[PDB]
Every structure is written in structure tokens, then in C-alpha cells.
Design a protein around this ligand. Sequence first.
Ligand SMILES: Cc1cc2nc3c(=O)[nH]c(=O)nc-3n(C[C@H](O)[C@H](O)[C@H](O)COP(=O)(O)O)c2cc1C
Ligand SMILES: [Cl-]
Length: 362
Amino acid sequence: NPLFSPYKMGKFNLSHRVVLAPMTRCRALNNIPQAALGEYYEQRATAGGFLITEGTMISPTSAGFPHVPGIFTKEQVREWKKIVDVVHAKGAVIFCQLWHVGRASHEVYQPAGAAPISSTEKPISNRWRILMPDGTHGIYPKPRAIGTYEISQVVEDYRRSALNAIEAGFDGIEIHGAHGYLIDQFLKDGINDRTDEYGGSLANRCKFITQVVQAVVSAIGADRVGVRVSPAIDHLDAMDSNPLSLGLAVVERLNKIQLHSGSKLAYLHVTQPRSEEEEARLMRTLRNAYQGTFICSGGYTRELGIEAVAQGDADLVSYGRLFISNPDLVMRIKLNAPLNKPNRKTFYTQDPVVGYTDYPFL
Ligand SMILES: Cc1cc2nc3c(=O)[nH]c(=O)nc-3n(C[C@H](O)[C@H](O)[C@H](O)COP(=O)(O)O)c2cc1C
Ligand SMILES: [Cl-]
């Protein structure tokens, strides 16, 4: 089984290729990592296995979901440390995903009920609704477009959050540059209508992700930095006129960062949408262009993951929904055992046990 051959992810020696995908679960009450998160990540931890956390706030303005953890206060760092410690005691490697939602927020999630920030003043359309703290759905508002000084401030929030992650003991961080959140609001020409040096051309639209990645690389080192993008996922009105072109432009900037650093990033992580053959060729084209480790994600099964590694299409395969419902997903894939079905009703609810740690083991 090629999913169970070992893999060197830079200085991290993985024993198998099954990765916990980052997943917002909303159990981090009032943005504090809770003991429940330790139980949940401990259940899914394996010796030599890689875990990526749910998206994690980099600043008081970065959230657009309730009860998502932060890593920008020293209190948050203190609580994360306890979670990292129980994961490392099972021999897993764990990265913290650093997440800013940009325009995908609401007054209820912002300090002083201020407007969310973005590359432009265009809001998400009424085809999308935001989950509110009371479990109903709300309207996305008009964001505020930020200038070049404030862009540098947001880059510094990424930098400080990455340093905080290392202080908590994380092995590395992942930059969340996908799914129509802040970075993707600069990448996608369906959102970025700027006329300054962050808008227009592919080089200009790539400037923000390049500045973010360079900042976290200088702070903690390239081999502790993973990058996640999704050029072909249209979520939250995040379309590009040429997804393959945009994706290859991002890869170009990552290859160039690696060569200036004399080091490789931890990985490039790309989620696909589910023309099945065109999307497959889009993924293989990004992988072939990127000089390093490639994680694929989005709709993978046991059989689709074995085939991705066997055919050279990916080095690592991350799983989301099957890892919600199967704490021992790795062992179930190894044994080719039945899989529990996930209950979508409790994906984002607040109970520390129900729908979170009570899916059974084999
Ligand atoms: C409940 C839920 C929350 C998610 N939260 C995040 C997130 O916080 N960050 C992110 O980059 N992707 C997030 N994702 C996407 C997953 O990381 C992953 O790409 C997707 O689940 C993989 O597809 P699969 O579920 O078919 O395995 C989330 C997915 C789900 C179902
Ligand atoms: Cl997401």
C-alpha cells in the first residue's frame, strides 16, 4: 500500500501519507483552544502521522466563524501548548493553519462591530450566507478595502502568529490561501478589482501571498511553512478567469522564494473541486511545476488516495470529512476496514463531545 510508505517532509520523517486536513469545528469557545480540541486531535494522532489544525485566527479581525481558536494572544498560546503536547506524545507532527477570512465575516464577529477588511469594497453576493453564533444564517456585509500600510500590518499579524505557533510547540504552520478568504480575495481576478500595485496583472495579484509567505519563512524557516491554495474552487464568489494560469503563477512565486532562501517549503497543499479529467490535469500540472512536496485534498477516498500516490500525482493525501467520523482513519485505511459516516449537523456545533469526540474506534 503506497499510502504506507514513509515520506520525508523536509526534516519531518512521516511513516505514512494519510494527512488530517484542516477543519473548522467551532469547539474553541470564545477563541480559546479548549481541552476538547486536545482530546479530538489526540484521537486522530498516529506515530509519524501529519495533522493540520482547523483554521486559526491571526488577529482580532480575522474571524468569520464562531468559537474558532486564535493564536495571537499569549493566553491562546498557553492553551495550544497543552494540545500540542498530547499530540507529540503520540508521535505525530502537527502544523497550525493560520487563517484570515477577509470579507467573509459579519459585524457580530468584528471588534466594535466594524466592517470586515478585504482587497476591495465588493461584498460576497446574496448567493452565500454566513453562519451566525445562534445557529442561523446572516448576510455578508460590504467590506472595507485596505491600503498598502494596512496590508503590511496584516503581514505582520501572520509573522507574529507564526512565531507564536512555534512558541506553543507546533512543528510548523500552514498559510490558508484558499476558498475565497483574505489571500484568495487578492489572488482571484473575480474579486480583486484594485488598480494599485496589488491589483490587475498576475504579478500584482500574487504580491500579497508572496509577502505573507516571505514573512513567515524569514521568521520560522521555510521547512516549517506549508502553503494552501485553491485556484479552481469558486466558494464565496471567488472565481478567476484562468485558474490554471493563476495557479501556475503562484507556484512560480513559491519556487522563487525557495531559491532565494536556499531551502524548500514544507509543502504545497491544493484542494480540488469535484470535468473530472480537466481538474485532474490541473492538479498534476501544479504538482509538476512545483519544486517540492505536494498534498492533494478534496473528495479523496481510500482508493483515490492510493492511486494518487502510486501514479506520482501527490506525495501526501489529506482527508477531511472521513477524518471527522473516523478517529482511527489511518488504521481503517491501512486495514481496508469499514468507515463511519459523518453527521453534517454537528460539524460546526459547540458541544465538546457530541459529534466531535464520540465517533467510535474500530
Ligand atoms: C467542516 C469542515 C471544515 C473545514 N474547515 C477548513 C478550514 O478551516 N481550513 C481549510 O483550509 N479547509 C477547511 N475545510 C476543507 C478541508 O480541509 C478539506 O480540504 C476537505 O474536507 C477535503 O475533502 P473531503 O472532506 O472530501 O476529504 C473544511 C472542511 C469541512 C468539511
Ligand atoms: Cl476553508
